[PDB]
Amino acid sequence: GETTDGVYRVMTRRLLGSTQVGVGVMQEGVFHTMWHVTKGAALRSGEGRLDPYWGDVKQDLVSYCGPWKLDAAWDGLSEVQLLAVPPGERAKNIQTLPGIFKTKDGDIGAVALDYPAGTSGSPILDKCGRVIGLYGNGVVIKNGSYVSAITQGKRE
Amino acid sequence: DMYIERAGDITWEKDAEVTGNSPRLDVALDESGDFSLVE
Ligand SMILES: C[C@H]1CC2(CN1C(=O)Nc1ccc3c(c1)CNC3)CC(F)(F)C2
């Protein structure tokens, strides 16, 4: 089916009507999304089938039709844009300065933007339009709002 | 079965809505890929 580069919605007909469970990026013939969106299940694109190729529950990432292609990184200084694709709503760019997740294994950028369930997998971009990571895996703070890590894979 | 639908091009938009703060949080990541706040 459709293999043009871009951001895509991940939909299902299992629940009531058509429900958006997440979002993903098509780049170089590979579909990239978060593991918790599909749970590693196969995908449909028109009449064509997309089979999982690589995945990891701890990184919360999965790739279809080929190895993970996204390798751009946040520079640790500049503002970034979340290309949010909420359920039933138009794709929208939101610019923000990321904070930081400090872990025992190093620091990771983090975006303090809150969207509904079904927005996970929306890409985070740098000023050149390169995907520096996917939005949708993070933490819930005091107020009840979300702060997502900038989750990036490794290009082998 | 899950299916995909195109939603747009991946481009930086000039004069986009600028929002959100930049918090520095100490976090832990478990084997199931879940983050938690360390305090
Ligand atoms: C609480 C909402 C808020 C959220 C992301 N959320 C999640 O629950 N993420 C999530 C769920 C299951 C797993 C993981 C992460 C990693 N391990 C399994 C929707 C959003 F994308 F808009 C921002």
Side-chain angles (χ1 to χ4, degrees):
Chain A
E2 200 167 20
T3 323
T4 307
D5 283 3
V7 65
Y8 287 68
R9 304 171 190 272
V10 182
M11 310 292 299
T12 179
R13 302 254 181 90
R14 171 187 61 110
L15 263 34
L16 192 75
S18 282
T19 306
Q20 184 178 310
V21 294
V23 178
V25 178
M26 190 73 73
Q27 184 167 130
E28 299 164 62
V30 169
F31 189 63
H32 309 73
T33 185
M34 304 212 79
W35 195 90
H36 76 264
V37 168
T38 69
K39 314 298 200 302
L43 300 175
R44 187 168 57 79
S45 178
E47 269 170 313
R49 188 182 172 125
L50 312 189
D51 297 322
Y53 180 99
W54 167 79
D56 190 288
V57 162
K58 192 170 167 188
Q59 295 182 49
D60 193 35
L61 290 177
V62 59
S63 72
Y64 287 79
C65 312
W68 187 269
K69 306 282 177 155
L70 317 177
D71 59 352
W74 179 47
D75 63 6
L77 291 187
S78 322
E79 285 199 341
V80 309
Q81 279 183 11
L82 163 65
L83 177 50
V85 186
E89 291 173 0
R90 201 147 46 238
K92 174 179 49 108
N93 291 67
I94 306 295
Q95 180 162 330
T96 192
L97 177 78
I100 303 291
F101 272 6
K102 307 185 178 181
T103 88
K104 70 180 211 273
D105 295 314
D107 301 355
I108 316 167
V111 291
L113 296 174
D114 210 352
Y115 283 89
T119 312
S120 293
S122 284
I124 298 153
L125 350 164
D126 61 15
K127 304 166 182 177
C128 303
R130 291 174 293 152
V131 180
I132 60 179
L134 307 183
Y135 168 89
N137 192 22
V139 98
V140 168
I141 55 168
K142 307 181 179 181
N143 36 72
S145 175
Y146 210 75
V147 172
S148 166
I150 300 178
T151 299
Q152 186 59 289
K154 183 191 174 183
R155 190 183 178 113
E156 284 301 296
Chain B
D1 233 13
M2 292 176 177
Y3 65 95
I4 62 169
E5 281 180 349
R6 200 163 185 270
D9 287 9
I10 300 178
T11 64
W12 176 268
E13 185 212 354
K14 285 178 183 180
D15 309 316
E17 181 213 339
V18 194
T19 199
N21 73 311
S22 324
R24 299 205 188 190
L25 306 171
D26 294 334
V27 302
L29 176 72
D30 73 15
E31 194 169 90
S32 310
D34 299 328
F35 285 104
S36 64
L37 287 163
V38 167
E39 298 199 41

PDB file of all heavy atoms in Angstrom, chain B residues 6-37:
ATOM      1  N   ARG B   6      -2.240   7.869   6.003  1.00  0.00           N
ATOM      2  CA  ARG B   6      -1.323   9.017   5.987  1.00  0.00           C
ATOM      3  C   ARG B   6      -1.947  10.230   6.667  1.00  0.00           C
ATOM      4  O   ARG B   6      -3.132  10.470   6.494  1.00  0.00           O
ATOM      5  CB  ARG B   6      -0.871   9.357   4.567  1.00  0.00           C
ATOM      6  CG  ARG B   6       0.412  10.178   4.567  1.00  0.00           C
ATOM      7  CD  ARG B   6       1.108  10.176   3.225  1.00  0.00           C
ATOM      8  NE  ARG B   6       2.390  10.875   3.319  1.00  0.00           N
ATOM      9  CZ  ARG B   6       2.541  12.178   3.103  1.00  0.00           C
ATOM     10  NH1 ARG B   6       1.501  12.925   2.756  1.00  0.00           N
ATOM     11  NH2 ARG B   6       3.732  12.747   3.242  1.00  0.00           N
ATOM     12  N   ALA B   7      -1.178  10.960   7.471  1.00  0.00           N
ATOM     13  CA  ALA B   7      -1.684  12.151   8.148  1.00  0.00           C
ATOM     14  C   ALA B   7      -0.909  13.438   7.840  1.00  0.00           C
ATOM     15  O   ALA B   7      -1.384  14.509   8.208  1.00  0.00           O
ATOM     16  CB  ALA B   7      -1.781  11.940   9.653  1.00  0.00           C
ATOM     17  N   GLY B   8       0.233  13.349   7.161  1.00  0.00           N
ATOM     18  CA  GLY B   8       0.977  14.548   6.789  1.00  0.00           C
ATOM     19  C   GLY B   8       2.447  14.350   6.487  1.00  0.00           C
ATOM     20  O   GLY B   8       2.969  13.237   6.582  1.00  0.00           O
ATOM     21  N   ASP B   9       3.112  15.457   6.096  1.00  0.00           N
ATOM     22  CA  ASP B   9       4.552  15.508   5.839  1.00  0.00           C
ATOM     23  C   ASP B   9       5.255  15.838   7.140  1.00  0.00           C
ATOM     24  O   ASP B   9       4.702  16.544   7.985  1.00  0.00           O
ATOM     25  CB  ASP B   9       4.923  16.620   4.833  1.00  0.00           C
ATOM     26  CG  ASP B   9       4.550  16.352   3.390  1.00  0.00           C
ATOM     27  OD1 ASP B   9       3.837  15.368   3.137  1.00  0.00           O
ATOM     28  OD2 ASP B   9       4.915  17.178   2.512  1.00  0.00           O
ATOM     29  N   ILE B  10       6.500  15.397   7.272  1.00  0.00           N
ATOM     30  CA  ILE B  10       7.296  15.710   8.444  1.00  0.00           C
ATOM     31  C   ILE B  10       8.185  16.887   8.090  1.00  0.00           C
ATOM     32  O   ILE B  10       9.205  16.722   7.417  1.00  0.00           O
ATOM     33  CB  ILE B  10       8.061  14.479   8.897  1.00  0.00           C
ATOM     34  CG1 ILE B  10       7.061  13.357   9.251  1.00  0.00           C
ATOM     35  CG2 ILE B  10       8.994  14.827  10.051  1.00  0.00           C
ATOM     36  CD1 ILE B  10       7.645  12.101   9.652  1.00  0.00           C
ATOM     37  N   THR B  11       7.750  18.098   8.483  1.00  0.00           N
ATOM     38  CA  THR B  11       8.470  19.349   8.244  1.00  0.00           C
ATOM     39  C   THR B  11       8.385  20.270   9.449  1.00  0.00           C
ATOM     40  O   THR B  11       7.398  20.254  10.190  1.00  0.00           O
ATOM     41  CB  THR B  11       7.934  20.113   7.011  1.00  0.00           C
ATOM     42  OG1 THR B  11       6.580  20.533   7.226  1.00  0.00           O
ATOM     43  CG2 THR B  11       8.076  19.334   5.711  1.00  0.00           C
ATOM     44  N   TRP B  12       9.395  21.116   9.613  1.00  0.00           N
ATOM     45  CA  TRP B  12       9.389  22.111  10.678  1.00  0.00           C
ATOM     46  C   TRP B  12       8.470  23.269  10.205  1.00  0.00           C
ATOM     47  O   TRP B  12       8.567  23.701   9.053  1.00  0.00           O
ATOM     48  CB  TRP B  12      10.814  22.629  10.878  1.00  0.00           C
ATOM     49  CG  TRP B  12      10.954  23.727  11.887  1.00  0.00           C
ATOM     50  CD1 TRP B  12      10.915  25.072  11.648  1.00  0.00           C
ATOM     51  CD2 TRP B  12      11.298  23.573  13.267  1.00  0.00           C
ATOM     52  NE1 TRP B  12      11.163  25.763  12.808  1.00  0.00           N
ATOM     53  CE2 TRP B  12      11.405  24.866  13.820  1.00  0.00           C
ATOM     54  CE3 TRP B  12      11.493  22.464  14.104  1.00  0.00           C
ATOM     55  CZ2 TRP B  12      11.726  25.077  15.159  1.00  0.00           C
ATOM     56  CZ3 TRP B  12      11.816  22.674  15.424  1.00  0.00           C
ATOM     57  CH2 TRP B  12      11.910  23.965  15.950  1.00  0.00           C
ATOM     58  N   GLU B  13       7.555  23.738  11.068  1.00  0.00           N
ATOM     59  CA  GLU B  13       6.671  24.843  10.707  1.00  0.00           C
ATOM     60  C   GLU B  13       7.132  26.141  11.362  1.00  0.00           C
ATOM     61  O   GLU B  13       7.203  26.216  12.585  1.00  0.00           O
ATOM     62  CB  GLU B  13       5.207  24.558  11.089  1.00  0.00           C
ATOM     63  CG  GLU B  13       4.273  25.658  10.603  1.00  0.00           C
ATOM     64  CD  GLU B  13       3.050  25.952  11.451  1.00  0.00           C
ATOM     65  OE1 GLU B  13       2.811  25.209  12.430  1.00  0.00           O
ATOM     66  OE2 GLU B  13       2.331  26.929  11.135  1.00  0.00           O
ATOM     67  N   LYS B  14       7.433  27.165  10.557  1.00  0.00           N
ATOM     68  CA  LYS B  14       7.838  28.462  11.093  1.00  0.00           C
ATOM     69  C   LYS B  14       6.627  29.126  11.733  1.00  0.00           C
ATOM     70  O   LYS B  14       5.520  29.027  11.197  1.00  0.00           O
ATOM     71  CB  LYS B  14       8.380  29.366   9.974  1.00  0.00           C
ATOM     72  CG  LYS B  14       9.777  28.987   9.498  1.00  0.00           C
ATOM     73  CD  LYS B  14      10.224  29.892   8.349  1.00  0.00           C
ATOM     74  CE  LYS B  14      11.578  29.516   7.796  1.00  0.00           C
ATOM     75  NZ  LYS B  14      11.979  30.406   6.675  1.00  0.00           N
ATOM     76  N   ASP B  15       6.832  29.812  12.864  1.00  0.00           N
ATOM     77  CA  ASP B  15       5.743  30.484  13.577  1.00  0.00           C
ATOM     78  C   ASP B  15       4.663  29.478  14.030  1.00  0.00           C
ATOM     79  O   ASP B  15       3.468  29.732  13.878  1.00  0.00           O
ATOM     80  CB  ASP B  15       5.109  31.627  12.747  1.00  0.00           C
ATOM     81  CG  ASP B  15       6.076  32.638  12.156  1.00  0.00           C
ATOM     82  OD1 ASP B  15       6.998  33.074  12.881  1.00  0.00           O
ATOM     83  OD2 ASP B  15       5.884  33.026  10.973  1.00  0.00           O
ATOM     84  N   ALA B  16       5.092  28.324  14.556  1.00  0.00           N
ATOM     85  CA  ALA B  16       4.176  27.335  15.114  1.00  0.00           C
ATOM     86  C   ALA B  16       3.818  27.792  16.553  1.00  0.00           C
ATOM     87  O   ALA B  16       4.504  28.663  17.111  1.00  0.00           O
ATOM     88  CB  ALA B  16       4.860  25.974  15.159  1.00  0.00           C
ATOM     89  N   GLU B  17       2.765  27.214  17.164  1.00  0.00           N
ATOM     90  CA  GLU B  17       2.410  27.571  18.543  1.00  0.00           C
ATOM     91  C   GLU B  17       3.536  27.107  19.485  1.00  0.00           C
ATOM     92  O   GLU B  17       3.879  25.933  19.479  1.00  0.00           O
ATOM     93  CB  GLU B  17       1.088  26.910  18.955  1.00  0.00           C
ATOM     94  CG  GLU B  17       0.673  27.271  20.371  1.00  0.00           C
ATOM     95  CD  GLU B  17      -0.074  26.183  21.119  1.00  0.00           C
ATOM     96  OE1 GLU B  17      -0.644  25.286  20.457  1.00  0.00           O
ATOM     97  OE2 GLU B  17      -0.093  26.236  22.370  1.00  0.00           O
ATOM     98  N   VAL B  18       4.147  28.035  20.236  1.00  0.00           N
ATOM     99  CA  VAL B  18       5.246  27.709  21.151  1.00  0.00           C
ATOM    100  C   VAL B  18       4.679  27.549  22.568  1.00  0.00           C
ATOM    101  O   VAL B  18       4.116  28.509  23.091  1.00  0.00           O
ATOM    102  CB  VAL B  18       6.372  28.781  21.135  1.00  0.00           C
ATOM    103  CG1 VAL B  18       7.621  28.257  21.807  1.00  0.00           C
ATOM    104  CG2 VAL B  18       6.697  29.250  19.719  1.00  0.00           C
ATOM    105  N   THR B  19       4.786  26.343  23.177  1.00  0.00           N
ATOM    106  CA  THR B  19       4.246  26.087  24.521  1.00  0.00           C
ATOM    107  C   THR B  19       5.023  24.977  25.284  1.00  0.00           C
ATOM    108  O   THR B  19       5.911  24.362  24.724  1.00  0.00           O
ATOM    109  CB  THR B  19       2.734  25.799  24.436  1.00  0.00           C
ATOM    110  OG1 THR B  19       2.152  25.994  25.728  1.00  0.00           O
ATOM    111  CG2 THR B  19       2.444  24.402  23.936  1.00  0.00           C
ATOM    112  N   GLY B  20       4.713  24.765  26.563  1.00  0.00           N
ATOM    113  CA  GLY B  20       5.357  23.738  27.366  1.00  0.00           C
ATOM    114  C   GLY B  20       6.575  24.218  28.128  1.00  0.00           C
ATOM    115  O   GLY B  20       7.360  25.022  27.618  1.00  0.00           O
ATOM    116  N   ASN B  21       6.743  23.721  29.357  1.00  0.00           N
ATOM    117  CA  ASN B  21       7.916  24.047  30.155  1.00  0.00           C
ATOM    118  C   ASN B  21       9.048  22.983  29.921  1.00  0.00           C
ATOM    119  O   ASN B  21       8.893  22.110  29.065  1.00  0.00           O
ATOM    120  CB  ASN B  21       7.528  24.264  31.640  1.00  0.00           C
ATOM    121  CG  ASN B  21       7.178  22.990  32.375  1.00  0.00           C
ATOM    122  OD1 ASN B  21       6.382  22.166  31.904  1.00  0.00           O
ATOM    123  ND2 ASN B  21       7.765  22.802  33.553  1.00  0.00           N
ATOM    124  N   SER B  22      10.202  23.097  30.605  1.00  0.00           N
ATOM    125  CA  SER B  22      11.374  22.212  30.429  1.00  0.00           C
ATOM    126  C   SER B  22      11.842  21.631  31.782  1.00  0.00           C
ATOM    127  O   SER B  22      12.887  22.024  32.300  1.00  0.00           O
ATOM    128  CB  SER B  22      12.521  22.987  29.772  1.00  0.00           C
ATOM    129  OG  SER B  22      12.078  23.929  28.805  1.00  0.00           O
ATOM    130  N   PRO B  23      11.079  20.711  32.392  1.00  0.00           N
ATOM    131  CA  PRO B  23      11.456  20.227  33.736  1.00  0.00           C
ATOM    132  C   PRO B  23      12.628  19.257  33.762  1.00  0.00           C
ATOM    133  O   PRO B  23      12.791  18.487  32.827  1.00  0.00           O
ATOM    134  CB  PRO B  23      10.174  19.561  34.234  1.00  0.00           C
ATOM    135  CG  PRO B  23       9.536  19.032  32.957  1.00  0.00           C
ATOM    136  CD  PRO B  23       9.812  20.106  31.929  1.00  0.00           C
ATOM    137  N   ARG B  24      13.449  19.307  34.823  1.00  0.00           N
ATOM    138  CA  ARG B  24      14.561  18.371  34.997  1.00  0.00           C
ATOM    139  C   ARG B  24      14.116  17.381  36.067  1.00  0.00           C
ATOM    140  O   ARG B  24      13.912  17.765  37.219  1.00  0.00           O
ATOM    141  CB  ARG B  24      15.875  19.089  35.376  1.00  0.00           C
ATOM    142  CG  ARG B  24      16.310  20.067  34.283  1.00  0.00           C
ATOM    143  CD  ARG B  24      17.802  20.373  34.219  1.00  0.00           C
ATOM    144  NE  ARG B  24      18.055  21.464  33.272  1.00  0.00           N
ATOM    145  CZ  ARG B  24      19.259  21.837  32.848  1.00  0.00           C
ATOM    146  NH1 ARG B  24      20.348  21.205  33.275  1.00  0.00           N
ATOM    147  NH2 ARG B  24      19.384  22.842  31.987  1.00  0.00           N
ATOM    148  N   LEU B  25      13.887  16.122  35.665  1.00  0.00           N
ATOM    149  CA  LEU B  25      13.339  15.090  36.538  1.00  0.00           C
ATOM    150  C   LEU B  25      14.257  13.882  36.684  1.00  0.00           C
ATOM    151  O   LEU B  25      14.763  13.398  35.681  1.00  0.00           O
ATOM    152  CB  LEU B  25      11.988  14.621  35.937  1.00  0.00           C
ATOM    153  CG  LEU B  25      10.957  15.722  35.641  1.00  0.00           C
ATOM    154  CD1 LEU B  25       9.776  15.185  34.859  1.00  0.00           C
ATOM    155  CD2 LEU B  25      10.489  16.405  36.935  1.00  0.00           C
ATOM    156  N   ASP B  26      14.421  13.346  37.914  1.00  0.00           N
ATOM    157  CA  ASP B  26      15.209  12.131  38.135  1.00  0.00           C
ATOM    158  C   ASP B  26      14.263  10.971  37.921  1.00  0.00           C
ATOM    159  O   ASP B  26      13.256  10.879  38.622  1.00  0.00           O
ATOM    160  CB  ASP B  26      15.764  12.082  39.569  1.00  0.00           C
ATOM    161  CG  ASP B  26      16.776  13.175  39.853  1.00  0.00           C
ATOM    162  OD1 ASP B  26      17.423  13.653  38.891  1.00  0.00           O
ATOM    163  OD2 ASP B  26      16.923  13.555  41.035  1.00  0.00           O
ATOM    164  N   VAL B  27      14.527  10.133  36.909  1.00  0.00           N
ATOM    165  CA  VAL B  27      13.629   9.036  36.590  1.00  0.00           C
ATOM    166  C   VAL B  27      14.365   7.678  36.574  1.00  0.00           C
ATOM    167  O   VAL B  27      15.600   7.615  36.482  1.00  0.00           O
ATOM    168  CB  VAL B  27      12.873   9.272  35.236  1.00  0.00           C
ATOM    169  CG1 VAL B  27      12.063  10.569  35.238  1.00  0.00           C
ATOM    170  CG2 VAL B  27      13.835   9.235  34.061  1.00  0.00           C
ATOM    171  N   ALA B  28      13.587   6.598  36.697  1.00  0.00           N
ATOM    172  CA  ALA B  28      14.058   5.222  36.627  1.00  0.00           C
ATOM    173  C   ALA B  28      13.255   4.512  35.517  1.00  0.00           C
ATOM    174  O   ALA B  28      12.086   4.824  35.308  1.00  0.00           O
ATOM    175  CB  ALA B  28      13.861   4.516  37.960  1.00  0.00           C
ATOM    176  N   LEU B  29      13.889   3.588  34.793  1.00  0.00           N
ATOM    177  CA  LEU B  29      13.235   2.873  33.715  1.00  0.00           C
ATOM    178  C   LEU B  29      13.320   1.377  34.027  1.00  0.00           C
ATOM    179  O   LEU B  29      14.423   0.839  34.246  1.00  0.00           O
ATOM    180  CB  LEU B  29      13.924   3.218  32.394  1.00  0.00           C
ATOM    181  CG  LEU B  29      13.421   2.482  31.167  1.00  0.00           C
ATOM    182  CD1 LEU B  29      12.045   2.991  30.753  1.00  0.00           C
ATOM    183  CD2 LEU B  29      14.401   2.621  30.023  1.00  0.00           C
ATOM    184  N   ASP B  30      12.161   0.723  34.146  1.00  0.00           N
ATOM    185  CA  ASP B  30      12.136  -0.690  34.490  1.00  0.00           C
ATOM    186  C   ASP B  30      12.177  -1.592  33.223  1.00  0.00           C
ATOM    187  O   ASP B  30      12.126  -1.094  32.091  1.00  0.00           O
ATOM    188  CB  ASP B  30      10.960  -1.017  35.450  1.00  0.00           C
ATOM    189  CG  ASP B  30       9.548  -1.012  34.854  1.00  0.00           C
ATOM    190  OD1 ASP B  30       9.419  -1.026  33.615  1.00  0.00           O
ATOM    191  OD2 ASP B  30       8.574  -1.036  35.636  1.00  0.00           O
ATOM    192  N   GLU B  31      12.297  -2.906  33.431  1.00  0.00           N
ATOM    193  CA  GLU B  31      12.363  -3.908  32.378  1.00  0.00           C
ATOM    194  C   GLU B  31      11.121  -3.887  31.456  1.00  0.00           C
ATOM    195  O   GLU B  31      11.255  -4.171  30.271  1.00  0.00           O
ATOM    196  CB  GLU B  31      12.605  -5.291  33.012  1.00  0.00           C
ATOM    197  CG  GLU B  31      13.017  -6.378  32.033  1.00  0.00           C
ATOM    198  CD  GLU B  31      13.497  -7.653  32.698  1.00  0.00           C
ATOM    199  OE1 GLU B  31      12.652  -8.540  32.963  1.00  0.00           O
ATOM    200  OE2 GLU B  31      14.718  -7.768  32.958  1.00  0.00           O
ATOM    201  N   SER B  32       9.941  -3.462  31.957  1.00  0.00           N
ATOM    202  CA  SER B  32       8.744  -3.366  31.098  1.00  0.00           C
ATOM    203  C   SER B  32       8.674  -2.051  30.273  1.00  0.00           C
ATOM    204  O   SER B  32       7.633  -1.771  29.662  1.00  0.00           O
ATOM    205  CB  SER B  32       7.475  -3.488  31.935  1.00  0.00           C
ATOM    206  OG  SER B  32       7.521  -4.609  32.800  1.00  0.00           O
ATOM    207  N   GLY B  33       9.732  -1.236  30.294  1.00  0.00           N
ATOM    208  CA  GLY B  33       9.737   0.020  29.549  1.00  0.00           C
ATOM    209  C   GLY B  33       8.924   1.143  30.182  1.00  0.00           C
ATOM    210  O   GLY B  33       8.579   2.117  29.516  1.00  0.00           O
ATOM    211  N   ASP B  34       8.619   1.032  31.476  1.00  0.00           N
ATOM    212  CA  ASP B  34       7.862   2.056  32.181  1.00  0.00           C
ATOM    213  C   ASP B  34       8.758   2.964  33.018  1.00  0.00           C
ATOM    214  O   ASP B  34       9.578   2.497  33.827  1.00  0.00           O
ATOM    215  CB  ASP B  34       6.768   1.428  33.057  1.00  0.00           C
ATOM    216  CG  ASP B  34       5.767   0.637  32.247  1.00  0.00           C
ATOM    217  OD1 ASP B  34       5.517   1.011  31.088  1.00  0.00           O
ATOM    218  OD2 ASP B  34       5.240  -0.350  32.768  1.00  0.00           O
ATOM    219  N   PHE B  35       8.569   4.269  32.847  1.00  0.00           N
ATOM    220  CA  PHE B  35       9.311   5.258  33.602  1.00  0.00           C
ATOM    221  C   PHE B  35       8.598   5.558  34.909  1.00  0.00           C
ATOM    222  O   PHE B  35       7.367   5.480  35.006  1.00  0.00           O
ATOM    223  CB  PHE B  35       9.466   6.554  32.802  1.00  0.00           C
ATOM    224  CG  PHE B  35      10.482   6.541  31.680  1.00  0.00           C
ATOM    225  CD1 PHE B  35      10.076   6.456  30.358  1.00  0.00           C
ATOM    226  CD2 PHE B  35      11.833   6.710  31.942  1.00  0.00           C
ATOM    227  CE1 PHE B  35      10.997   6.527  29.318  1.00  0.00           C
ATOM    228  CE2 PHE B  35      12.759   6.762  30.900  1.00  0.00           C
ATOM    229  CZ  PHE B  35      12.336   6.655  29.592  1.00  0.00           C
ATOM    230  N   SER B  36       9.380   5.899  35.923  1.00  0.00           N
ATOM    231  CA  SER B  36       8.824   6.308  37.206  1.00  0.00           C
ATOM    232  C   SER B  36       9.699   7.404  37.794  1.00  0.00           C
ATOM    233  O   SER B  36      10.905   7.443  37.527  1.00  0.00           O
ATOM    234  CB  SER B  36       8.691   5.128  38.160  1.00  0.00           C
ATOM    235  OG  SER B  36       9.958   4.579  38.488  1.00  0.00           O
ATOM    236  N   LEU B  37       9.093   8.316  38.565  1.00  0.00           N
ATOM    237  CA  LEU B  37       9.827   9.405  39.193  1.00  0.00           C
ATOM    238  C   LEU B  37      10.560   8.893  40.418  1.00  0.00           C
ATOM    239  O   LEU B  37       9.999   8.130  41.201  1.00  0.00           O
ATOM    240  CB  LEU B  37       8.855  10.515  39.628  1.00  0.00           C
ATOM    241  CG  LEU B  37       8.272  11.350  38.490  1.00  0.00           C
ATOM    242  CD1 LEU B  37       7.040  12.110  38.946  1.00  0.00           C
ATOM    243  CD2 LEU B  37       9.300  12.321  37.954  1.00  0.00           C
TER     244      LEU B  37
END
